[PDB]
Design a protein around this nucleic acid. Structure first.
Ligand SMILES: [Mg+2]
Ligand SMILES: [Mg+2]
Ligand SMILES: [Mg+2]
Ligand SMILES: [Mg+2]
Ligand SMILES: [Mg+2]
Ligand SMILES: [Mg+2]
Ligand SMILES: [Mg+2]
Ligand SMILES: [Mg+2]
Ligand SMILES: [Mg+2]
Ligand SMILES: [Mg+2]
Ligand SMILES: [Mg+2]
Ligand SMILES: [Mg+2]
Ligand SMILES: [Mg+2]
Ligand SMILES: [Mg+2]
Ligand SMILES: [Mg+2]
Ligand SMILES: [Mg+2]
Ligand SMILES: [Mg+2]
Ligand SMILES: [Mg+2]
Ligand SMILES: [Mg+2]
Ligand SMILES: [Mg+2]
Ligand SMILES: [Mg+2]
Ligand SMILES: [Mg+2]
Ligand SMILES: [Mg+2]
Ligand SMILES: [Mg+2]
Ligand SMILES: [Mg+2]
Ligand SMILES: [Mg+2]
Ligand SMILES: [Mg+2]
Ligand SMILES: [Mg+2]
Ligand SMILES: [Mg+2]
Ligand SMILES: [Mg+2]
Ligand SMILES: [Mg+2]
Ligand SMILES: [Mg+2]
Ligand SMILES: [Mg+2]
Ligand SMILES: [Mg+2]
Ligand SMILES: [Mg+2]
Ligand SMILES: [Mg+2]
Ligand SMILES: [Mg+2]
Lengths: 14, 129
RNA sequence: GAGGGCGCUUACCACUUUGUGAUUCAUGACUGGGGUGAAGUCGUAACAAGGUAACCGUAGGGGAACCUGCGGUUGGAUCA
RNA sequence: UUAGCUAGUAGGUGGGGUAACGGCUCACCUAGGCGACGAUCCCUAGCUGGUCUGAGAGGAUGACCAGCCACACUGGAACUGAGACACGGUCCAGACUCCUACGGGAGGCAGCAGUGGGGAAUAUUGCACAAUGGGCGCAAGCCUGAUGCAGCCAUGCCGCGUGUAUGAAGAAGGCCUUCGGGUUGUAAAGUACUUUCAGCGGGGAGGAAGGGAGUAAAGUUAAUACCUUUGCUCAUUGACGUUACCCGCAGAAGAAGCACCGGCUAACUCCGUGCCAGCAGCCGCGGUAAUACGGAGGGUGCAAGCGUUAAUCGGAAUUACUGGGCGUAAAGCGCACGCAGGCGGUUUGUUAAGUCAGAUGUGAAAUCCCCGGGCUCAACCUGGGAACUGCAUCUGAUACUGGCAAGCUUGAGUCUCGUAGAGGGGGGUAGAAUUCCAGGUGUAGCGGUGAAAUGCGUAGAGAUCUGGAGGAAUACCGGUGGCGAAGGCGGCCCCCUGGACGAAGACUGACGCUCAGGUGCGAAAGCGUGGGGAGCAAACAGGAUUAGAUACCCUGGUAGUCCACGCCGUAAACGAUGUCGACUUGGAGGUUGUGCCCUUGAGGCGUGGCUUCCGGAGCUAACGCGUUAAGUCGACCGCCUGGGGA
């Protein structure tokens, strides 16, 4: 949910 | 905590507008005066006064229609977790031009309607819908 | 004479040999489970207070579903 | 489920080296270099301009066109030359095949085709330098499997025809039918008209500019020669090509199929078959009435194509930045500390870092978009513009973010006076109750269950009383009561020690929030060593129950429960809600304080901390939450992506 979380690891596409 | 004080300002406006409050108070600052004075000049609120110099306390007078919310909703856009910036031609409108978008530039705080004659861009503060 | 070439030797080094490691595929006796199976056998666990309330974690038990011991929870009935 | 990698490695001196700088190379000197902003290792992959999909953001990929890099049987090396470590150059080794008089040599189709083979699957062993580009030469000329063309392959896109006018008892036939009638159906026939293309004959643009022979002018030169250039004239230059195009002829003559028909999704009846056969993308159809199977009738959707399979995106907001959730649907680590990282109150100055404004340069062409032009049209080709949201630099503005400087106090802290509490650890101590043991009085059953039995007892049980020993737990108080980060924590007393909260001020001046790795705590079971032993009690002993009893029930009973010393670190470790802060109507209470008040009672009035039950607005899938949020928001972190596998 947090944009700063996605800096470390993006959303994992299946 | 209180790390986004403009978002704290928008919280205190939206609550008392919906909960039929007559007037609200909040801790003042330089930037909060530069936003509420623009909203006073855009018909959304009525009046603002300053109280205290060692603890600056800002006050806002609410505004109603028949007991109905004038400011229906307001949306914080940029934030300390994610900064938002646009150019002089990428300025977004609110409700296709009905609502105003508070954008602070080097020529002071103005709207995107007022930024057409100024020709500048910068930080989006809030969508006054 | 100066100088060159040939030849020899040396340095570098491909391929190649032994010793002995790491990694990968194929094959592979045997072996570990799991899934897919309406009618097969064995039992009646759970869902009602499902006939010893159920469940989670842990140790032990025995064809098996499970059981008991300790502790916790209500995702339990009846309640005062 | 890759955390350490690296000694010519990192840097320096000097020598050497190439076309140029340089560990590019060598001796010496230093011990550094790289790396949680992914070093290194493993696997995969040519990349980009783009194509496709998508409203856009994104997503998947890199064939034809163009740009670059690498490669030319495998491996290594150098020469030549301006340029190669060299596709049709060489040298060496290996692999394979060919020639051979046996000693030897020859060869590199990932160039054009073409064969063998692989695979679901991709072509003629063609023509030409006419044009364009390139190579050589003064030119002529030659060469070019580049390229221009042709054939094959409905392989894709686009265009046209397979007739049109007229023609109702509306014939026949098929099928439906309440046999009355409708359907096929102006459809056919017949009546009139016409010839796109093909077929058959004729004419025929453009792709071609040049080049070659005379010749005048100009030019230099001793020169009217020769040559250079500008002119004019004559004869010529086409693979495609039987060119497009056009004239003329004959007559509808040469030219329509496939899929579907329950719903999604366009169209309804009939017969045959009988959960058999079959159908099918999903839903699920058919054992005696199936529009879903098979066939017929009729229709629908497309069209020289039509279906199917496989693959990519969309639909899918179904990895959610745009644009999702985590109380019970999958998901908030058991909790706490804290580095790196992210983020940060308020006032002023400064820097202009981020951002924004303007401008330059650049973002190759082609593709896409805008208006045009051209091929009879379209596809296709093409003019200019826009687009390419990119990157670099300069000049600006200073509100916000960042840095520096000086601050300020409401955030967060510090002191004093106090109050409450099962907060933890350590050491003593009390009294019931349980059981054991000693003694006394005392007698036939005690014990246990739904009912009985095992078991105990005439050595006197049990019951009672006296006295002693050991072990573990703390009735009542005690309550949605209190405390602790949580698991949890309960006799009293002492000692040591932790946080929480309130009052009055004084004081430091953002000292803060949050947290991946890391670090510690962390119910009980169980594990190691040494103690300890009442009661309870896995396994087990024995008796009932029963079909069997392994469980239930009962009589006993070891490990364990207890303590020290460690280890184990999982729980339905739950408020099934991560922490912090800011706000938004309220009640019934509880607990804990404090301020004032005819103290006129343990009271009246306020006002903070903690906590439960109701409930408005609002939110929610519903349940419910609802000032302690699951209401409206911010700061940061964890976690989930169908069920099962797991
Ligand atoms: Mg059962
Ligand atoms: Mg049960
Ligand atoms: Mg229990
Ligand atoms: Mg040097
Ligand atoms: Mg090509
Ligand atoms: Mg290429
Ligand atoms: Mg090369
Ligand atoms: Mg080579
Ligand atoms: Mg060759
Ligand atoms: Mg080829
Ligand atoms: Mg084959
Ligand atoms: Mg008929
Ligand atoms: Mg024709
Ligand atoms: Mg001509
Ligand atoms: Mg329909
Ligand atoms: Mg069919
Ligand atoms: Mg039938
Ligand atoms: Mg067509
Ligand atoms: Mg598929
Ligand atoms: Mg999506
Ligand atoms: Mg969802
Ligand atoms: Mg769940
Ligand atoms: Mg928790
Ligand atoms: Mg371009
Ligand atoms: Mg162009
Ligand atoms: Mg174009
Ligand atoms: Mg046209
Ligand atoms: Mg006792
Ligand atoms: Mg001070
Ligand atoms: Mg053991
Ligand atoms: Mg038992
Ligand atoms: Mg032990
Ligand atoms: Mg767990
Ligand atoms: Mg609950
Ligand atoms: Mg209500
Ligand atoms: Mg409520
Ligand atoms: Mg899964």
């Amino acid at each position: 949910a947090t944009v700063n979380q996605l800096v470390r690891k993006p959303r994992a596409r299946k | 905590s209180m790390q986004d004080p403009i978002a704290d300002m928008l919280t205190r406006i939206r609550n008392g507008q919906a909960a039929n409050k007559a007037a609200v108070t909040m801790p003042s600052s330089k930037l909060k005066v530069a936003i509420a004075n623009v909203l006073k000049e855009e018909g959304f609120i009525e009046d603002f006064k300053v109280e205290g110099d060692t603890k600056p306390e800002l006050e806002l007078t609410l505004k109603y229609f028949q007991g109905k919310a004038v400011v229906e909703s307001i949306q914080r856009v940029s934030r300390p977790g994610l900064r938002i910036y646009k150019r002089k031609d990428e300025l977004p409108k609110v409700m296709a031009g009905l609502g105003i978008a508070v954008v602070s530039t080097s020529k002071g705080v103005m709207t995107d309607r007022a930024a057409r004659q100024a020709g500048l861009g910068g930080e989006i503060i809030c969508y006054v819908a």
